[PDB]
Assembly symmetry: C2
Homo-oligomer: 331 residues x 2
């Protein structure tokens, strides 16, 4: 029974949920001949009440080179990047939920992702199978991809449809744990843009640039706009789309008017929908945010690592779209 040394970067909601999940599920790890042992837990706020042993709290960066795995969920881009690089360079895998880091620091991280060292199922739709879903979709050639990827904006739009104001909805989303103190990334559609970029890279273009995604949020939406849409038998949702145009892949995030019965319009939780040849049309749904939900994704990748499987690999090569896609009508 050798130890599975884990260096955890981030003691927030997600990090805490993950730490506790690993210890709670220790017997599942035993089936693999290992017992989990955390080298330390880096925390931004060492005084915030936590369910992590005091002796493991680290207010300052610590040596990660002796870890078997580095798990990161601290948000932000530059600091996490500088912290994980040394480990990745040492050949230590990185399990992360940081969609911002992967989307904006791909120039530095791609090389390691290319050699299967980065596991990031939790980076898109939390623990819901989004990346593994596309890995299986590789059996076909993508025709079009559309998803409602942000938990906060989805909740807000759902609540406004019920008559709740933008503000009441947002504050509740924060109380519920879906959104952070400053949900600006979420409501401006940037978080969805981060995730869409990750999906594009795994399926059609390993070097897809985050800067090419055109993104807009829900800031102009009101209960009035949503009720008028309902009157026409449509639902408004912030959709992240990947489709062909002029022979090149185009990615955009924007509110779209969807038929009320469309899978994306009637989904429970966030959702990813695709049309591919020859499979056809398929889609997956589940929670897109939350401490427990995200922890499930990180733990899923830890088990994937223990099984001997590589991390999530970028698409083998860039491939053009098989057909021009027709975007949904914008709001």
């Amino acid at each position: 029974m050798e130890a599975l040394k884990i260096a955890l970067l981030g003691g927030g909601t997600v990090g805490s949920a993950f730490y506790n999940l690993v210890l709670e599920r220790a017997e599942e790890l035993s089936a693999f001949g290992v017992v989990p042992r955390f080298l330390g837990v880096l925390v931004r706020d060492p005084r915030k009440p936590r369910a992590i042993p005091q002796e493991l709290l680290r207010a300052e960066p610590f040596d990660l080179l002796e870890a078997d795995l580095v798990v990161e969920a601290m948000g932000g881009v530059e600091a996490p990047l500088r912290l994980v690089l040394p480990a990745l360079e040492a050949g230590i895998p990185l399990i992360t939920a940081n969609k911002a880091l992967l989307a904006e620091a791909w120039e530095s991280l791609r090389p390691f992702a290319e050699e299967g060292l980065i596991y990031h199922e939790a980076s898109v739709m939390a623990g819901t199978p989004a990346l593994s879903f596309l890995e299986t979709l590789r059996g076909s050639e993508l025709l079009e991809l559309h998803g409602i990827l942000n938990g906060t904006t989805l909740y807000i739009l759902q609540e406004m449809e019920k008559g709740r104001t933008y503000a009441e909805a947002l504050l509740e989303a924060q109380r519920l744990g879906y959104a952070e103190a400053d949900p600006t990334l979420d409501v401006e559609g940037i978080d969805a843009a981060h995730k869409l970029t990750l999906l594009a890279r795994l399926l059609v273009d390993p070097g897809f640039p985050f800067a090419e995604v055109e993104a807009q949020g829900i800031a102009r939406l009101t209960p009035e706009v949503l009720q008028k849409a309902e009157a026409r038998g449509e639902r408004v949702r912030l959709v992240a789309s990947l489709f062909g145009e002029g022979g090149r892949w185009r990615a955009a995030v924007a509110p779209r008017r969807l038929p009320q019965d469309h899978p994306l319009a009637r989904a429970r939780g966030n959702a990813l929908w695709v049309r591919a040849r020859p499979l056809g049309e398929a889609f997956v749904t589940g929670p897109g945010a939350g401490g427990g939900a995200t922890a499930s994704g990180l733990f899923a990748d830890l088990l994937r690592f223990l099984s001997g499987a590589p991390g999530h690999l970028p698409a083998p090569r860039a491939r053009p779209p098989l057909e021009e896609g027709s975007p949904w009508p914008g709001v």
Copy 2:
């Protein structure tokens, strides 16, 4: 570079679709440093019209030991079993869509599956992500699982739903090739039982016996029974359930009255619904049968193999249900 030698067992609808899909996307495999070549295709009778070159057809078993991969979609149990064992024993991976073989010949196949030599995403819900979906769900502990796994009975109920009699619906399912001349396996819920058994082994009990799955088919269903259901706001579907009962796992297939709003009742294609802790509720749906759909799943596994990832592994150990469940009412 190297060659990717493939021995194909089954030249039917799936076999033919897989053969042509590999040829259509062969150049793509160069990204993995390989060039695909089929060593031969085992078929019942090479005299029949087939979209595979006559010269590649083999009417009698042929040596498989030079193959890099054996792909099988013959249907049946004992014949396929005796043909693939020699390859597996020699360390050659098996990519199969044969849920019957895996469900009923597990005693012989499990050891190889444990070694990561068996890839069978296409054995459940065709190319739609089902096994990969559950692999990610491993991040949580299963509360309950319910799926509509058989394409034939889904089509049948969707039609009887519209007012078609059982015989009328079945005939069309057959006339369109969804159901065989003798649809027994499908309509008695055995195919669903096979697939449910596979899902159970991957997620909660590597030794789950097919013999313990309690299956009931469509025999007691009529268009009227469905009207009664429609009147009460429900839909009837043949559901494969895995839930806790008495602190042990119970697996059953049977027609169920689902609230019409439920993801399972709304699904146009086959579907898998799950509730787990701490993830919550997740759902995946897509085509569950068909040549192209199944080929997509087989090809997805070929890509998984080329990436250095092992096949689908059985649960690392058996573990009891965390909570007591109970399927919807039956008929």
